[PDB]
């Protein structure tokens, strides 16, 4: 995140912010096939879809 001073609220959002930053940096910090490079995002989206319609 950019701000964090709350005791219990902002940390949970910061967790997903860090997860998003990791997902965004795990495609350009190391060169690889674009196949899996996009498959990771597509599979994350698919997993997030069917769990909660």
């Amino acid at each position: 995140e950019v701000k964090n001073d709350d005791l219990e609220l902002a940390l949970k959002k910061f967790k997903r912010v860090s997860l998003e930053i990791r997902r965004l940096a795990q495609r350009h910090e190391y060169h690889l096939r674009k196949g899996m490079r996009l498959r990771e995002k597509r599979k994350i989206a698919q997993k997030k879809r069917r769990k909660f319609r």
Binding site: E1, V2, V17, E20
Partner: protein, 65 residues
């Protein structure tokens, strides 16, 4: 979601619509997908291109602040 789909114009352009942009854009300066924005598919690409222009236009940062 966008007012443009609710009025009918079939396109948008950067006329400093930043207000509605803040509904589509997280405070993290990253474009949320079609789910959050609420466009159907056409205004979705319109707001996508507008947000990308704003990135180019420096209306919205890429990530740097």
């Amino acid at each position: 979601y966008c007012r443009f789909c609710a009025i009918g114009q079939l396109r948008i352009d950067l006329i400093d619509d930043l207000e509605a942009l803040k509904r589509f854009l997280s405070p993290y300066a990253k474009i949320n997908p079609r789910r959050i924005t609420g466009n159907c598919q056409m205004h979705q690409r319109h707001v996508a291109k507008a947000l990308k222009r704003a990135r180019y236009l420096a209306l919205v940062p890429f990530v740097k602040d």
